[PDB]
Write a protein that binds this ligand. Structure first.
Ligand SMILES: CNC(=O)c1cc(Cl)ccn1
Length: 291
């Protein structure tokens, strides 16, 4: 799977909000382009003169994420974050020249991402009360990953002593994205656990935080809530469900070739962090079938 790389695998089955610190700093921002940020401005102008209803929005930038020594007390993860924008994304990661920017960042800064917007995404492995994960089909008419399978998520817009408010907005945003797109009541959702961070090598290495969320409704009830919104209540064109039993071998199925990179990251991290039992009971052959 060359289109997805794991940047972080969380310990202990995944991390709750109270165990994560963020450092939001202009030291974590994109570096100005070698020939100047006028190249980004020019791409944006061209785009607005064809689609004048488009708007810019601020986004979080991932610089890096450092895990504490395993088994330790106190905060377990430090997220180093900057600020970027949808406009900066369109002029860097989305650019035809994105590979040239990665090579220049290696040369100039010893950092393939130094000249990339790298907006932070969020995604969920969302499990039902009857033990299915939730999948969504993308429109065949959108610019990114048309017609592919996705999981719930999005790219949060901003608004440890401003750090804890930033971690809160990240955890809040994955629940909000489930309520907005799947049309589930907020009171049917667990507090999220962070599973890890995955990079999309098809979009020049931009990263998504991947979470586990449990719903108290069954697959049939989740379907009813999604469909009862009508075609205008969701950006996706369909919902479907796979038994957690069968997620284990998804990379061996014909579905795998249809998953967008950030959804592949969510399923790999679900399989490594929530699946793959460590103890004698769940690791017994009748409960963990060989092969
Ligand atoms: C229309 N696309 C988006 O809203 C989007 C925004 C960002 Cl920041 C990254 C990828 N896609």
């Amino acid at each position: 799977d060359p289109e997805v790389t794991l940047l972080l695998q969380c310990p202990g089955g995944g991390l709750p909000q109270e165990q994560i610190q963020a450092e939001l700093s202009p030291a974590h921002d994109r570096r100005p382009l070698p020939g100047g940020d006028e190249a980004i401005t020019a791409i944006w102008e061209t785009r607005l003169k064809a689609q004048p209803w488009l708007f810019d929005a601020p986004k979080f930038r991932l610089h890096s994420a450092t895990l504490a020594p395993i088994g330790s007390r106190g905060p377990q993860l430090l997220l180093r974050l900057g600020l970027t924008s949808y406009r900066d994304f369109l002029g860097t990661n989305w650019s035809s020249s994105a590979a040239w920017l990665r090579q220049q960042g290696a040369t100039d800064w010893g950092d393939t991402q130094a000249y990339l917007a790298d907006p932070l995404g969020v995604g969920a492995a969302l499990a039902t009360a009857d033990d299915f994960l939730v999948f969504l089909r993308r429109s065949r008419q959108v610019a990114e990953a048309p017609g592919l399978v996705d999981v719930p998520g999005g790219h949060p817009e901003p608004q440890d002593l401003a750090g804890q408010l930033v971690v809160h907005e990240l955890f809040s945003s994955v629940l909000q994205e489930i309520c907005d797109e799947v049309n589930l009541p907020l009171l049917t959702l667990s507090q999220p656990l962070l599973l890890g961070i995955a990079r999309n090598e098809t979009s020049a290495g931009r990263a998504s935080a991947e979470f586990y969320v449990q719903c108290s409704l069954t697959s049939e009830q989740v379907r009813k809530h999604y469909l009862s919104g009508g075609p205008e209540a969701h950006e996706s064109t369909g919902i479907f469900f796979v038994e957690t039993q069968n997620v284990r071998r998804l990379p061996e199925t014909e579905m795998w070739a249809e998953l967008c990179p950030s959804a592949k990251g969510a399923i790999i991290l679900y399989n490594r962090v929530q699946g793959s039992p460590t103890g004698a009971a769940l690791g017994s052959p009748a409960l963990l079938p060989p092969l």
